[PDB]
Design an enzyme around this catalytic site. Structure first.
Site, mmCIF file in Angstrom:
data_model
loop_
_atom_site.group_PDB
_atom_site.id
_atom_site.type_symbol
_atom_site.label_atom_id
_atom_site.label_comp_id
_atom_site.label_asym_id
_atom_site.label_seq_id
_atom_site.Cartn_x
_atom_site.Cartn_y
_atom_site.Cartn_z
ATOM 1 N N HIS A 62 0.804 -1.228 0.000
ATOM 2 C CA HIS A 62 0.000 0.000 0.000
ATOM 3 C C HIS A 62 0.837 1.278 0.000
ATOM 4 O O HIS A 62 0.327 2.359 -0.300
ATOM 5 C CB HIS A 62 -1.058 0.025 1.112
ATOM 6 C CG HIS A 62 -0.620 -0.609 2.394
ATOM 7 N ND1 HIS A 62 -0.191 0.123 3.483
ATOM 8 C CD2 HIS A 62 -0.569 -1.910 2.769
ATOM 9 C CE1 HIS A 62 0.120 -0.703 4.469
ATOM 10 N NE2 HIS A 62 -0.099 -1.940 4.060
ATOM 11 N N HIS A 92 6.158 6.434 6.141
ATOM 12 C CA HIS A 92 5.752 6.006 4.808
ATOM 13 C C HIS A 92 5.145 7.213 4.099
ATOM 14 O O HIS A 92 4.980 8.265 4.719
ATOM 15 C CB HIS A 92 4.721 4.881 4.913
ATOM 16 C CG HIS A 92 3.472 5.285 5.632
ATOM 17 N ND1 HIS A 92 3.330 5.159 6.998
ATOM 18 C CD2 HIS A 92 2.324 5.847 5.184
ATOM 19 C CE1 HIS A 92 2.142 5.612 7.360
ATOM 20 N NE2 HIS A 92 1.512 6.039 6.280
ATOM 21 N N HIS A 94 2.181 8.868 0.979
ATOM 22 C CA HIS A 94 1.028 8.704 0.111
ATOM 23 C C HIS A 94 1.252 9.683 -1.027
ATOM 24 O O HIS A 94 1.734 10.782 -0.802
ATOM 25 C CB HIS A 94 -0.268 9.033 0.860
ATOM 26 C CG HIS A 94 -0.471 8.221 2.107
ATOM 27 N ND1 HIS A 94 -1.205 7.053 2.126
ATOM 28 C CD2 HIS A 94 -0.046 8.417 3.379
ATOM 29 C CE1 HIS A 94 -1.215 6.559 3.351
ATOM 30 N NE2 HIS A 94 -0.523 7.369 4.131
ATOM 31 N N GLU A 104 -3.153 13.303 1.670
ATOM 32 C CA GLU A 104 -4.364 12.834 2.326
ATOM 33 C C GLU A 104 -5.060 14.022 2.968
ATOM 34 O O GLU A 104 -6.202 14.341 2.639
ATOM 35 C CB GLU A 104 -4.003 11.760 3.355
ATOM 36 C CG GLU A 104 -3.370 10.535 2.703
ATOM 37 C CD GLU A 104 -3.644 9.248 3.446
ATOM 38 O OE1 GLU A 104 -3.321 9.168 4.647
ATOM 39 O OE2 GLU A 104 -4.187 8.301 2.835
ATOM 40 N N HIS A 117 4.108 10.468 6.473
ATOM 41 C CA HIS A 117 3.590 10.186 7.807
ATOM 42 C C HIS A 117 4.658 9.523 8.657
ATOM 43 O O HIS A 117 5.123 8.428 8.334
ATOM 44 C CB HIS A 117 2.385 9.260 7.707
ATOM 45 C CG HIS A 117 1.169 9.923 7.148
ATOM 46 N ND1 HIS A 117 0.134 9.213 6.567
ATOM 47 C CD2 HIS A 117 0.803 11.225 7.093
ATOM 48 C CE1 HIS A 117 -0.804 10.050 6.177
ATOM 49 N NE2 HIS A 117 -0.426 11.281 6.485
ATOM 50 N N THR A 196 -5.222 6.232 8.724
ATOM 51 C CA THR A 196 -5.879 6.465 7.441
ATOM 52 C C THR A 196 -5.886 5.230 6.544
ATOM 53 O O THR A 196 -6.402 5.279 5.425
ATOM 54 C CB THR A 196 -5.251 7.634 6.668
ATOM 55 O OG1 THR A 196 -3.951 7.242 6.205
ATOM 56 C CG2 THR A 196 -5.149 8.871 7.548
HETATM 57 C C1 LIG Z 1 1.199 0.207 12.735
HETATM 58 C C2 LIG Z 1 0.868 1.477 12.063
HETATM 59 O O1 LIG Z 1 1.593 2.431 12.196
HETATM 60 N N1 LIG Z 1 -0.310 1.528 11.234
HETATM 61 C C3 LIG Z 1 -0.743 2.584 10.580
HETATM 62 S S1 LIG Z 1 0.008 4.123 10.385
HETATM 63 C C4 LIG Z 1 -1.293 4.773 9.432
HETATM 64 S S2 LIG Z 1 -1.370 6.388 8.783
HETATM 65 N N2 LIG Z 1 -1.553 6.325 7.178
HETATM 66 O O2 LIG Z 1 -0.181 7.111 9.206
HETATM 67 O O3 LIG Z 1 -2.463 7.042 9.442
HETATM 68 N N3 LIG Z 1 -2.232 3.793 9.312
HETATM 69 N N4 LIG Z 1 -1.926 2.612 9.930
HETATM 70 C C5 LIG Z 1 -2.824 1.468 9.890
HETATM 71 ZN ZN LIG Z 2 -0.154 7.258 6.154
HETATM 72 ZN ZN LIG Z 3 -0.210 -3.973 5.258
#
Ligand SMILES: CC(=O)/N=c1\sc(S(N)(=O)=O)nn1C
Ligand SMILES: [Zn+2]
Ligand SMILES: [Zn+2]
Length: 258
Positions: A62, A92, A94, A104, A117, A196
């Site tokens: 993702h 990571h 987006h 986002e 993020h 998110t």
């Molecule tokens: C373990 C972990 O950090 N999970 C995450 S971080 C994230 S986010 N996209 O930063 O809000 N979404 N999720 C599911």
């Molecule tokens: Zn994120």
């Molecule tokens: Zn995953």
């Protein structure tokens, strides 16, 4: 994952396996500058990434993610709207199918080319697993990316993306300093929200920096070479891996600055 970002498994479908997708504190949101009011009680953000210890970089199907050793208070976030101390576990991104979208969070409905993020968990809960069950379990530092001059601190990341093209590929990624991904100003907006991506848990204090970082077109184009699919599977290019703004509902966004 059964969930993704396409027509058949994207954000409109998520609520079927994760009902909280329609919850009262979902993220991301639009940040409306008319209504995101300065709060003089907000403190300066404290980012201590000096001893950050990166471990791996991976394509998780993702996004691409860089992980950190969170066994002690090496790299922590505190201050800001936060009580207590939060350890960095991963970052990571987006991004979009073009420079005109990909973030986002939005600011006055405007979309940035990407969003970083940096995810942190509250040490008072012992580990990530218990933290995600608490409304103040996580702190995510969100940073917008715009296309401009190159960000030197991002180059180490961009340079290995071709080696993790497909879902499940990963690589050794040590000695990466996440301080190199931060803009000059730590002025921020903050509000209570959620993860998110699934499981979309409402355990996040969001801290979104006002100032975007600039990355070069050359840099962001490498993001768009990634694939959602695993090796040998039908190609699905990893672009537009962003969840749209969700309704703020009964929440308030506060600004640390005037
Ligand atoms: C373990 C972990 O950090 N999970 C995450 S971080 C994230 S986010 N996209 O930063 O809000 N979404 N999720 C599911
Ligand atoms: Zn994120
Ligand atoms: Zn995953």
């Amino acid at each position: 994952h059964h969930w993704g970002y396409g027509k058949h498994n994207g954000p409109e479908h998520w609520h079927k396996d994760f009902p909280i997708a329609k919850g009262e504190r979902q993220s991301p949101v639009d940040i409306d500058t008319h209504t995101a009011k300065y709060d003089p009680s907000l403190k300066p953000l404290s980012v201590s990434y000096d001893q950050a210890t990166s471990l791996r970089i991976l394509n998780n199907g993702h996004s691409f993610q860089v992980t950190f050793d969170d066994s002690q208070d090496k790299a922590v976030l505190k201050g800001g709207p936060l009580d207590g101390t939060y350890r960095l576990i991963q970052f990571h991104f987006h991004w979009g199918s073009l420079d005109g979208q990909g973030s986002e969070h939005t600011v006055d409905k405007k979309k940035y080319a990407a969003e970083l993020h940096l995810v942190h968990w509250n040490t008072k809960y012992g580990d990530l697993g218990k933290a995600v069950q608490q409304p103040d379990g996580l702190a995510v530092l969100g940073i917008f990316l715009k296309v401009g001059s190159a960000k030197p601190g991002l180059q180490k990341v961009v340079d290995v993306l071709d080696s993790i093209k497909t879902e499940g590929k990963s690589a050794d990624f040590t000695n990466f300093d996440p301080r190199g991904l931060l803009p000059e100003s730590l002025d921020y907006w903050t509000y209570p929200g959620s993860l998110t991506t699934p499981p979309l848990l409402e355990c996040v204090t969001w801290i979104v920096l006002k100032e975007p970082i600039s990355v070069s077109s050359e840099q962001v184009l490498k993001f768009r070479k990634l694939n959602f699919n695993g090796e040998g599977e039908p190609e699905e290019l990893m672009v537009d891996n962003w969840r749209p703004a969700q309704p703020l509902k009964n929440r308030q966004i506060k600004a640390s600055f005037k």
